[PDB]
Amino acid sequence: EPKREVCELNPDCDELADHIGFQEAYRRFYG
């Protein structure tokens, strides 16, 4: 799952994903 893998390897994205999930985090950072 590209988005989870990518988001995990950005501390701010991983942090955000802890609250809102990786799809929503990835979209905020890499939209």
Q: Which residues are annotated as a binding site?
A: 1, 5, 8, 14
- Known binding site for Ca(2+): residues? 1, 5, 8, 14
3-class secondary structure per residue, the chain: CHHHHHHHCCHHHHHHHHHHCHHHHHHHHHC
Residue 7 · residue 22 · CB < 8 Å: yes
